[PDB]
C-alpha cells in the first residue's frame, strides 16, 4: 500500500561538485516547501499529489528519531498524522510567508538568563537541516553562555563532561514554550570509543530575499513531532514519543 504521483517533473543531476554530495548517504532531495520557491517553476511532489487527489487530508507529518540506532530512523506520514509517535495534542502556528514553511518565532531564551530573537523574528521549519541555525552574531553569544568553543563553518564543540550542567534553551512559538534540554540541543557524535559533543546550534546569516532566518532543524523536529498543513497553511508541534 503506497502512492504513485504520475507525470512528475524532476531533475536528472549530471554535475554535483563539492564534498556535500560525496558526504550525502542519500541519492537526491525531494523538496516539500511551496511551489513559490521551485527552481524552473516545476510543480512540487506534494502539490501534484494534492492535485491528483491521492490524500484525504492535504497534510504531511515527521517523526525523527534522536537515537541513531533506534528503528525506524523516522517516519513521514503522507495524508495524516501518526498518533503513536507523539505525546498529547498538537499545537498550531500559522505560516507567515508561504515559500518556505515559515512561522513567527516570539523569542529564544536560555535558562542562564540570555535572550536572543528578543523582540521576535522569522523562522523556517526545515527537515533537511540537521542543526538549529541562527544569525552569526546572536549564536556566537549563545555559544559563549553554554561555554562551547568555535569549530569551523559556524559550528561549535562542548566537552561532554560539561553538557549535563548546561542551561535549558526555550523557543517561544504560538505564545507556548518549546523546551530543549542540553541533551536535546547537543549531538553526541561517537565512534571507536571517542565521543565529541557538537552544539546543535550553528551560526549562519541567511541573506535577503530569503533571510535573515532561524532554521528550526532536526534537533527541534526530533524533539517535537511536526505537522505540515497545506490545507490550513499551519505547522503543528507535539512532544515526540521517546524512551
Amino acid at each position: 500500500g503506497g502512492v504513485k504521483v504520475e507525470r512528475q517533473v524532476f531533475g536528472e543531476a549530471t554535475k554535483q561538485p563539492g564534498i556535500t554530495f560525496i558526504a550525502a548517504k542519500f541519492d537526491g532531495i525531494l523538496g516539500m516547501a511551496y511551489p513559490r520557491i521551485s527552481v524552473n517553476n516545476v510543480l512540487p511532489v506534494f502539490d501534484n499529489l494534492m492535485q491528483q487527489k491521492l490524500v484525504d487530508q492535504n497534510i504531511f507529518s515527521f517523526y525523527l528519531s534522536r537515537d541513531p540506532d533506534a528503528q525506524p530512523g523516522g517516519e513521514l506520514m503522507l495524508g495524516g498524522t501518526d498518533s503513536k509517535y507523539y505525546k498529547g495534542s498538537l499545537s498550531y502556528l500559522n505560516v507567515t510567508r508561504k515559500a518556505y514553511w515559515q512561522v513567527h518565532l516570539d523569542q529564544v531564551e536560555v535558562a542562564s538568563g540570555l535572550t536572543l530573537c528578543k523582540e521576535g523574528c522569522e523562522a523556517i521549519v526545515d527537515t533537511g537541516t540537521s542543526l538549529m541555525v541562527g544569525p552569526v552574531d546572536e549564536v556566537r553569544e549563545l555559544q559563549k553562555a553554554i561555554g562551547a568553543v568555535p569549530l569551523i563553518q559556524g559550528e561549535y564543540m562542548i566537552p561532554c563532561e560539561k553538557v549535563s550542567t548546561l542551561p535549558a534553551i526555550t523557543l517561544k512559538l504560538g505564545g507556548k514554550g518549546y523546551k530543549l534540554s542540553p541533551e536535546d540541543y547537543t549531538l553526541k557524535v561517537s565512534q571507536a570509543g571517542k565521543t565529541l559533543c557538537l552544539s546543535g546550534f550553528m551560526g549562519m546569516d541567511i541573506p535577503p530575499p530569503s533571510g535573515p532566518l532561524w532554521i528550526l532543524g532536526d534537533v527541534f523536529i526530533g524533539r517535537y513531532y511536526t505537522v505540515f498543513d497545506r490545507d490550513n497553511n499551519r505547522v503543528g508541534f507535539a512532544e515526540a514519543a521517546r524512551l
Binding site: 512528475q8 542519500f26 525531494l30 541513531p68 530512523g73 505540515f228
Partner: protein, 98 residues
C-alpha cells in the same frame, strides 16, 4: 488512508527514505526536505569517475515505459551545495514498491 514512509537516520545528521521513479520503479533514497521545493536524483548521464555520480543510484530513462522527455537545464543552490543537470518527467512512487 495515510501513506507511511519509513526513514533511515544516519548519525542524527541525515534522514532519508526510499522512493521510486519510473515504470517499473527505479529506487532512490531522498531527503524529504521542507527547506526546498524541487525533486532531483543522479542521472545515468553523469561522469562515472565523479565520486558523487558513482557512489549513488542513477536514473535511466531507457528502463522506464512512462518517461516523458523535457531536457530543460536546471541549477540548484542549497545552503551546503550546488548541482546541475536537466529536467525529465516520470511517475514517482512512495515508497519505491519495485
Amino acid at each position: 488512508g495515510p501513506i507511511p514512509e519509513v526513514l533511515k537516520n544516519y548519525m542524527d545528521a541525515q534522514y532519508y527514505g526510499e522512493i521510486g521513479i519510473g515504470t517499473p520503479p527505479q529506487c532512490f533514497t531522498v531527503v524529504f526536505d521542507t527547506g526546498s521545493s524541487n525533486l532531483w536524483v543522479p542521472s545515468i548521464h553523469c561522469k562515472l569517475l565523479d565520486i558523487a555520480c558513482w557512489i549513488h543510484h542513477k536514473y535511466n530513462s531507457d528502463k522506464s515505459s512512462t518517461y516523458v522527455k523535457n531536457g530543460t537545464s536546471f541549477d540548484i543552490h542549497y545552503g551546503s551545495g550546488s548541482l546541475s543537470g536537466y529536467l525529465s518527467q516520470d511517475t514517482v512512487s512512495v515508497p519505491c514498491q519495485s
